[PDB]
Paper text:
In this study, solving the crystal structure of HA derived from A/Thailand/CU44/2006 (CU44) led to a surprising finding of a divalent cation Zn2+ bound to the head regions of two neighboring trimers. Surprisingly, the highest peak in the anomalous difference electron density maps was located at the head domain at the inter-trimer interface, which was tentatively identified as Zn2+, based on native gel electrophoresis and absorption-edge fluorescence scan results. In the crystal structure, the HA trimers line up in an alternating up and down orientation with head-to-head interactions, where Zn2+ is bound between two adjacent HA trimers. In the HA structure, the carboxylic oxygen atoms of Glu68 and imidazole nitrogen atoms of His137 are directly coordinated to the divalent cation, which results in a distorted octahedral, six-coordination geometry, involving bidentate interactions of carboxylic groups. The Zn–O and Zn–N bond lengths are from 2.0 to 2.2 Å. The amino acid residues, Glu68 and His137, coordinated to Zn2+ are highly conserved in a broad range of H1 subtypes, although they are substituted with Asp or Tyr, respectively, in the early 1918 pandemic and the seasonal 1933–1936 strains, and not conserved in other subtypes and type B. The divalent cation in the crystal structure appeared to enhance the stability of HA, but significantly decreased the melting temperature Tm of the CU44 HA, depending on the Zn2+ concentrations. The acid-induced conformational change of HA occurred even at neutral pH in the presence of Zn2+. When the purified HA crystallized at 10–20 mg/ml by mixing with an equal volume of precipitant solution, protein crystals were produced at less than 0.4 mM Zn2+, whereas precipitates were found at higher than 0.4 mM. Taken together, our results suggest that Zn2+ binding to HA has two phases: Zn+2 binds specifically to the head regions of HA at low concentrations, whereas, at high concentrations, it binds nonspecifically to HA, causing conformational changes similar to those induced by acidic pH.
The HA structure has two distinct regions. The head region is composed of the receptor binding and vestigial esterase domains of HA1, whereas the stem region includes a long central helix of HA2. HA is a highly dynamic molecule capable of mediating a pH-dependent transition from a prefusion to postfusion state during virus entry. The prefusion conformation of HA is metastable, and the receptor binding head region acts as a clamp to keep the stem region in its metastable prefusion state at neutral pH.
Residue numbers in the entry:
A (entry chain G): 3 to 322
B (entry chain H), D (entry chain F), F (entry chain L): 1 to 165
C (entry chain E), E (entry chain K): 3 to 323
């Protein structure tokens, strides 16, 4: 009778302390390296795939973002690294990176017209576009904002209020226009002082137009600075202006949720129902570690820089 | 390695042996073969399954961790985010890599103990009944058939020693 | 002669690497799980209990915070998650969250009347209160700020200066008021242009009033924006305004220290002494770990989400032959 | 476990023995009893006291750690704050749980070593002086009285072996 | 024949899990504790030694920082903990700390006269200095900005544009002056309105002078606020103004690079070629850890608070034949 | 300590022995001396060198990390920054110190095993050819010269026992 141990044909290398390249009979992967390569769903729900639009263009309605206006639910957001459709008319997006974080929290929308184009602004012209915001061969403008202009040689004092009876927080966006000439300012709003007041119960900001010559971006010398605020259930927001107001047309009743986020990726869309998604692809998660991408969405394994993570289960293999 | 059995006084494993991690190779008149042990084998499988499971358990699944997009005037905060994101990945990498590295040695030393502990419990069984060659083998002076040989699992022996001194 | 080992009836469970539920002769709970349940003292000194007041009210002196004005030294601060007093006059508290962090460093106050109400402003009416800031049924205002108004149909040019001889940093607070009508602006301050200048050697800001209609908050259509700055030893602060200045009355000479903090808690106060305080209760720290709360104050065991942290000391227990 | 003493060739512990972790149960004609060892016992307590204290030393007390309360436009900075605070809690929770888990197997095997180290040093003393039964006991050829029995702590024996063959 | 083990005279104490003070035959220090004590070079290339100047003064051209204007390349930057030469003419430095973080990435400069003093401003006097910015006994001014004043009782409408043809981001600086009196404003710019427009395709800001009396710092009651913006390749920056514009004179075409940084250190400069530099001194990095300083430059050992970190390699030492 | 060799049945080391970690001290009539082992020493050197190299490998070089200078209305971001910097220093200090502390006992016990593994393979070779005294030494009944002495590392023995019984 002889007492011994098992051995097989296994070529499973393992790095232990005091000895490398140690072949062993049994082990376990312990690290996920392969990925699906495609943009999957997330436990059924589909991601907000933005295409050529940036979040700025998606939420403001860059007219070239026509198709994104429909979708009001999603599991996560995917954005191109350099989307050419966004603030089609030049201007600054106040707290833009934050609105990304606000929306990165959002799980569902209720897009609704706070101030309907027809009948919200009588006595003010609303038929105003820019070649900067051109769509389908014609000059256009954002679908969610609205350019108020003087009507019949007059831009009468403006004052509009909205009441949040949506029992959800309502994201209102608006803009202020700065003409390049004093000529453009006088012909457009028929006044040179021009105030623009926006008041919620916890938000106040008075904008005044700074007229000056600026370098042409999207062949436009003027600018429209884009602002926005959250309006809690019950709150009312008061709009007052003498001219230069880029009024809100469509707003959003935001629904908050659990882990969502914006990712950058060139991976294609598929019908796979993955539980974890990364910019590189989905992951069929069973292991504790992974090394495909630090960006991750859902229930996923911890990302690590490692290549191996061997972890023997059996014993040394010694044939011959 | 740590114990003298594997790669020590038992210089190899047996490709012939399947059905387990440890066992014996009896050389009897009623046929020979590699009878795989049961008690210590399943015990080692139990222990290794808990090691693995008790280790992946200590790793909560990474939930949504995405980039943060800072503006033209927030480089400091932009770097701080990177310092946190990287500083932690560095910590989880080390924790992950150092765990397999050290605990792999423990596992081999763990198996070494089990085989060496199996080399015992038979020397404690075959107190004076066989000549021990330091190769992990025992030549019986007895003519132990495949009935008493299968009695190395328990041991109720036709005990009398035969004169062989 | 026999070689063996000790054993008892101990039921001390322990998870080892190759086996869970391993009974052992001796072990030790390496993790603290029980807590005091009350807001205790911290090495004898008491914490600043804000009651129904928020930091906004305590530092501005919400008349309804009558009782917090005495305490001027403390080990830590307790705040209700949703404190019902605070501002009381609607507006923005410029940099509120930083000022909370500023006081999180503070170990003691010396509240003093930088601009005494009586004799600071002759030729300016200083008798101003609001129903929005009511105390004991009557209309009132903050104890530390002050609302200057026109006097005899005149709001003369204002210039008041303070030079810091307290050789401690002085937290200077003030505010600017925004009427809803042009009438209130004209009827109250006797001018519609209205400037408000506040200039130190490390702080300069010019304030101008924005008149407009706003949603009613605390039955008020106007607003008062609340500002503030720390003024280092030797420095001077100059307040100038043509109207709309809520002048400072009391400011604070800060003494900085280590270890205080703002915690939110509904646990009650007692006379127990304790080395560690959490929103949940005090902790009698001797262990290196704990799991009652991630927020902690004083010298405490490091917080972990763990439940056991057992750590055997002895060996396996095998009774009954 | 790792060594064969506990739950191995000494399948149980002695409720009778107090005053130490290891010891003996001598069966002499002048009375029996559980004389608990001292040297290996106090030596073991020193080490376990060192391990424990050397482990809690490596854990500095926390201190005041307070929330940070951000505003409605500081959402990014809030998550980064939540990302740092949570990320560190995890690194400490995991480490703490993984430490007792790994170090428990080490302590249990340490007592195993200590016991197996005591089963020896007596086989090394009773070279030909007693019959070794694998239950951790030694049946004497000698009639070792309660004078030489306590001389197992050191051993200055009237050594000549008596035949029992 | 006897079997045993090695031993030597080694006094190497080490700590094990169940035993302290264990002397051993062989070990390794595993932790760097000694350092060079001097500010050395870094793989040959030398640091931008700022001397008595602060980043604000170096990049603005504080006349007292005459000698720093030449250096346009460096491995790292060193600042005295209390540099007495910076913004000689008081004012706010808009986003100063960010501009510092901006310069931490820059590995090379290209300082060039964006708006040449002679020929950039005819019809405006540019020979304007202040005793606050005195250099070498005479009042001076910043070397990179330029003080535009009235010429022949007129401050004509101003408009200067620059186009970035350098294929690198152009760090443009400028400032706005706020007089203390209304007298100085009218006497200096011949107007009380005074606008200042600065416009990129990614940056727009209109500056206005807030006139008020402020505490004299560097005996000056006025102030100059310092603004700046990086100008992307292809982009143009337009400056328009009615007065109070401290025009840019010299700009910087920044070249970004790898791991550089700003450190505070009072150690002297030497000629050593260190692979790692810390505020305390250089480190001849071979060990995996270090404890001289947490701040570090180059490729260095991880910083830890530890004192020992021995790690035996050999075995227990038992001498005496 | 963990194994019975060091400070156990071989209570000491030999200053005389150099050129290796383990070996022998033969006391022969043809001269004595400290012939240091070769196979077990260089094998242990390989392992500890890999241990060390495998430990510092798991530690990335700290590239530029510098202070960040926050503003007067940025106490919060200033404190969060310090919370990160300190938190990571705390984690690396504990990871570093706890590693040498734990790995020190493992390294010492590793040598213990190597020596106890050398005490065997010689007790296992000199089955009945030498007297085993409990001080780690073997008294030859043989007068084993400098030919069979280098034949204890290996061996094709003039095996027949000559009587001393
Ligand atoms: C939604 O998103 C889509 C993208 O999917 C976007 O459509 C693109 O819009 C841009 C304009 O913003 C278009 O780029 C233009 O291309 C024109 C033709 O291409 C020329 O150059 C290429 C390469 O050399 C040649 O192969 C080709 O034969 C042409 O020579 C071009 O005419 C445009 O260039 C100038 O023209 C206009 C007015 O005439 C004016 O904006 C500028 O003068 C402009 O830029 C000039 O060049 C540089 C830029 O590198 C600039 O720095 C410089 O200041 C300008 N010169 C002067 C004197 O000022 C421009 O390059 C593009 O073709 C469109 N389509 C696609 C498929 O890309 C929509 O506009 C978006 N809709 C929204 C947001 O509503
Ligand atoms: C934080 O915020 C709250 C306010 O939101 C405040 O709590 C209340 O504080 C007030 C005092 O301002 C309490 O109100 C009443 O005061 C009367 C005075 O009591 C006598 O006490 C002594 C000796 O006799 C003298 O000093 C004094 O002059 C008086 O002689 C008292 O008569 C009131 O009692 C009850 O009567 C009516 C019945 O309708 C009711 O309106 C009261 O609210 C109270 O009713 C309820 O009954 C029972 C028994 O009291 C009680 O179990 C129940 O909780 C009460 N109500 C509620 C909603 O819980 C009363 O004392 C009042 O008790 C305090 N609590 C509440 C909930 O209002 C805190 O003091 C603030 N903390 C600070 C500022 O630190
Ligand atoms: C940061 O800021 C300070 C001030 O800007 C500066 O250092 C201090 O001040 C001066 C620099 O302005 C330092 O050196 C001086 O050198 C001059 C004379 O030496 C010769 O210098 C050059 C080159 O050789 C030539 O012009 C010519 O050869 C000069 O003769 C002179 O300015 C100083 O001389 C003495 O007299 C002045 C009055 O003019 C008096 O104020 C000084 O205190 C000084 O007395 C000397 O004191 C020092 C202290 O020990 C020492 O040199 C000695 O005891 C005294 N002199 C003698 C002959 O024994 C002076 O030599 C000066 O040393 C700096 N002081 C300190 C304490 O460092 C830094 O250099 C600046 N760093 C920068 C800008 O990077
Ligand atoms: C480049 O860097 C150099 C440093 O190498 C700077 O120079 C140093 O800094 C000061 C400005 O030049 C000089 O400081 C001096 O200190 C002396 C102390 O007695 C004295 O000469 C002055 O200080 C006070 O002295 C008098 C009191 O009796 C006052 O009349 C006098 O005006 C000063 O008074 C008050 O000082 C306090 C400070 O606590 C202030 O709070 C008050 O505001 C001051 N009074 C008033 C009315 O405002 C004098 O300041 C120092 O000499 C000088 N030189 C050196 C070598 O350090 C350069 O300025 C700097 N240049 C740049 C940046 O362009
Ligand atoms: C993102 O941006 C790019 C450009 O800004 C854009 O890619 C364009 O997509 C559309 C559709 O995929 C393409 O428009 C087509 O152009 C060619 C002909 O040159 C054809 O694919 C189409 O013509 C035929 O197809 C259909 C019949 O089977 C009919 O639809 C049609 O009448 C024709 O018969 C159509 O003209 C365009 O060419 C590309 N450009 C590229 C790929 O460079 C993309 O759509 C944008 N994504 C958005 C806005 O979501
Ligand atoms: C210190 O804190 C106390 C609370 O602890 C605070 O007093 C409370 O204030 C609010 C508002 O004054 C009260 O809540 C009210 O409930 C009553 C009846 O139950 C209503 O009349 C109020 O309704 C509104 O009425 C109109 C319709 O909406 C509006 O035009 C108007 O603006 C009112 O908001 C409101 O629902 C509450 O009763 C009191 N009292 C208590 C005990 O809570 C006090 O004001 C704080 N200190 C200071 C100085 O403000
Ligand atoms: C080991 O053996 C089986 C067949 O006996 C085979 O399927 C497997 O691929 C082999 N692996 C090797 C040779 O690496
Ligand atoms: C490492 O890899 C295999 C075994 O893992 C084997 O060839 C040898 O040990 C090493 N490689 C070479 C080329 O020797
Ligand atoms: C717009 O026009 C008429 C005056 O022509 C006016 O009576 C009416 O009320 C106005 N509607 C508004 C301001 O909504
Ligand atoms: C305003 O104050 C002046 C300051 O000298 C003083 O004469 C008087 O109290 C006031 N002026 C009046 C009442 O005309
Ligand atoms: C009072 O100050 C205002 C602005 O500060 C100014 O217009 C007015 O001339 C001043 N009155 C004086 C100096 O009498
Ligand atoms: C500052 O000066 C005033 C004199 O008006 C004095 O009352 C006060 O005590 C001084 N401060 C200190 C700390 O002494
Ligand atoms: C709880 O508090 C102190 C302080 O840590 C501690 O030493 C003591 O044992 C406990 N009991 C009492 C009554 O303080
Ligand atoms: C550590 O050991 C050294 C050398 O054996 C000795 O000098 C010193 O006293 C010891 N230190 C202790 C035990 O703290
Ligand atoms: C001032 O400069 C402008 C152009 O920069 C020129 O038109 C004008 O004639 C100049 N005036 C002089 C030189 O007096
Ligand atoms: C660094 O300095 C010299 C040159 O490299 C070298 O001889 C010395 O040993 C080094 N010092 C260390 C590694 O502490
Ligand atoms: Zn369309
Ligand atoms: Zn000079």
């Amino acid at each position: 009778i002889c007492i011994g141990y098992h051995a097989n044909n296994s070529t499973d290398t393992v790095d232990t302390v005091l000895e490398k390249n140690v072949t062993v009979t049994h082990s376990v992967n312990l690290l996920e390296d392969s990925h699906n390569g495609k943009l999957c769903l997330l436990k059924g729900i589909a991601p907000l795939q933005l295409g050529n639009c940036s979040v700025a263009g998606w939420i403001l309605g860059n007219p070239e973002c026509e198709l994104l206006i429909s979708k009001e639910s999603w599991s996560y957001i995917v954005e191109k690294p350099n989307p050419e459709n966004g603030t089609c008319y030049p201007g600054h997006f106040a707290d833009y990176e934050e609105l990304r974080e606000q929306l990165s929290s959002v799980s569902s929308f209720e897009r609704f017209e706070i101030f309907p184009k027809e009948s919200s602004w009588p006595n003010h012209t609303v038929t105003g576009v820019s070649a900067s915001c051109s769509h389908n061969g014609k000059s256009s403008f954002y679908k969610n904002l609205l350019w108020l202009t003087g009507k019949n040689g007059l831009y009468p004092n403006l004052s509009k209020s909205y009441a949040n009876n949506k029992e959800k927080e309502v994201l209102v966006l608006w803009g202020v226009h700065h003409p390049p000439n004093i000529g453009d300012q006088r012909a457009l709003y028929h006044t040179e002082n021009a105030y623009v007041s926006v008041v919620s119960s916890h938000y106040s900001r008075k904008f005044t137009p700074e007229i000056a010559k600026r370098p042409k971006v999207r062949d436009q010398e003027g600018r429209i600075n884009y602002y926005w605020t959250l309006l809690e259930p019950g709150d009312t927001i008061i709009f007052e202006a003498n001219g230069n107001l880029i009024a809100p047309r469509y707003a959003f009743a935001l629904s908050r949720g659990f882990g969502s986020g914006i990712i950058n990726s060139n991976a294609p869309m598929d019908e796979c129902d993955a539980k974890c998604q990364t910019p590189q692809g989905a992951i069929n998660s069973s292991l504790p570690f992974q090394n495909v991408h630090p960006v991750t969405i859902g229930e996923c394994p911890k990302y690590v820089r490692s290549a191996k993570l061997r972890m023997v289960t059996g014993l040394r293999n010694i044939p011959s | 390695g740590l114990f003298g059995a594997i790669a020590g006084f038992i210089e190899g494993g047996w490709t012939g042996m399947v059905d387990g991690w440890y066992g014996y190779h009896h050389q009897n008149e009623q046929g020979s073969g590699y009878a795989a042990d049961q008690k210590s084998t399943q015990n080692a499988i139990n222990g290794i399954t808990n090691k693995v499971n008790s280790v992946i358990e200590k790793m909560n699944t990474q939930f949504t961790a995405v980039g943060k997009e800072f503006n033209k005037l927030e480089r400091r905060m932009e770097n701080l985010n990177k310092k946190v994101d990287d500083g932690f990945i560095d910590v989880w990498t080390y924790n992950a890599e150092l765990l397999v590295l050290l605990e792999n040695e423990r596992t081999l030393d763990f198996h070494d103990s089990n085989v060496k502990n199996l080399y015992e419990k038979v020397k404690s069984q075959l107190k004076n009944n066989a000549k021990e060659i330091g190769n992990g083998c025992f030549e019986f002076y007895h003519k132990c058939n495949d009935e008493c040989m299968e009695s190395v699992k328990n041991g109720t022996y036709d005990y009398p020693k035969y004169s062989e001194e």
